Design a protein around this ligand. Sequence first.
Ligand code: LZ6
Ligand code: LZ6
Ligand code: CA
Ligand code: CL
Ligand code: CL
Lengths: 209, 209
Amino acid sequence: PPYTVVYFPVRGRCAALRMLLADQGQSWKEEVVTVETWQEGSLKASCLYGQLPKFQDGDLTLYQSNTILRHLGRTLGLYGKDQQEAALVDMVNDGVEDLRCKYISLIYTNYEAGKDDYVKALPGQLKPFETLLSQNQGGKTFIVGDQISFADYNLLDLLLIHEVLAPGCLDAFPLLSAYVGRLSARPKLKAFLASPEYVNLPINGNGKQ
Amino acid sequence: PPYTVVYFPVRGRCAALRMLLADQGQSWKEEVVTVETWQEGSLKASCLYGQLPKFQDGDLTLYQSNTILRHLGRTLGLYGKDQQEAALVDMVNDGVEDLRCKYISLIYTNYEAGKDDYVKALPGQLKPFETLLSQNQGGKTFIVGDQISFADYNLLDLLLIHEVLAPGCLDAFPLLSAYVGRLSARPKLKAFLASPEYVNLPINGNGKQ
Ligand SMILES: N[C@@H](CCC(=O)N[C@@H](CSCCN(CCCl)c1ccc(CCCC(=O)O)cc1)C(=O)NCC(=O)O)C(=O)O
Ligand SMILES: N[C@@H](CCC(=O)N[C@@H](CSCCN(CCCl)c1ccc(CCCC(=O)O)cc1)C(=O)NCC(=O)O)C(=O)O
Ligand SMILES: [Ca+2]
Ligand SMILES: [Cl-]
Ligand SMILES: [Cl-]
């Protein structure tokens, strides 16, 4: 295959791009990095920002999960129908990235002490996405416009992991709830989500979710 | 156009996009929001993610600083020559964003106790950008390719604020040092950087830098 994903054995910041690749019927290779191989130091020192994921598209070596998403969004036509839609797609993805950073902080730095406050603040953090859906064809299609974008796969992942963290958190958000059901039912994506390559990886690397 | 920037009276997350507009000879309106006006709650409630900056481009309203940069990048041709370069531009911008988030965390949440460790870690955080320069025309043009991109304005701002936090932090990095001097001397940008509109705003909102 022309694509390779280089990452720890976790869903994490590769879950959305994997969903995108599977739903778009693309082939790729998974190169798995163990904690031990990481600790040896050589791979880390060779990574641009000392971190994973690393992604290869032929001889193009990328880092940064959102860079990978935008690159696939460009090359596979998942980035809006025009320049204005592309901006809206970026606006959604940046909002998803902001919440994901908060989620990552909770999971890895403050799970015990922070979980109650986080879950209390969650409706206010999810509401913008419900608002975006409500303003786009009554929430019946995608997060921007009438075709899927890379921001849909990232938002979907963000919602899926939040359902595990805070079961029922989308009960307050009918359009988000229906949206998760709808996208999750896309045949190639449904198959991927049920498959061992997805199900047998943990969401995060520290046993918390 | 026309362009409107809605923000607090600080450089912060609008510095790069202002540098971009000035350097590109664009006109814009600053809509300054005071802390007092923000605390009233009304503008905040109307903001997609309850935050500034907000940006207007004719009938298009955007939020998210990097969405604004990418939109200006796309519409003004500051996004590399092709898709491969666009990906590289995103990779640089996402690395700038990661370090900006670290800088913001330090400034706003942990300056006194955290500055020493931050400054000790700083060389390892800047080196990737020196490495990128070294791999592109010997560092003699821009961060990606042969034309300026939105990532250059964001990296330039990141470098400038880091020189204030940690004077001498570029001294070990000749390509970054030369790059800052070169970009800063571009006539319109030089004029902007010297102007009261830039000089008489604080970098951050809490008196720290
Ligand atoms: N802005 C970047 C951020 C990427 C990022 O933050 N990557 C981190 C986080 S990667 C996911 C967390 N992680 C690394 C911890 Cl050091 C990790 C996750 C899963 C496993 C395996 C599972 C272990 C288990 O379940 O017990 C091991 C490590 C990383 O590479 N850490 C290594 C380092 O900085 O030295 C992006 O968006 O790509
Ligand atoms: N991912 C987003 C992040 C945007 C963001 O973090 N914006 C914040 C940070 S804006 C800069 C910090 N700030 C707001 C703190 Cl209430 C602020 C900064 C400067 C001043 C005035 C300066 C006073 C002075 O020292 O002279 C007032 C507020 C914001 O709007 N906060 C307000 C809120 O959430 O209610 C993006 O990139 O745009
Ligand atoms: Ca150009
Ligand atoms: Cl992660
Ligand atoms: Cl800021």
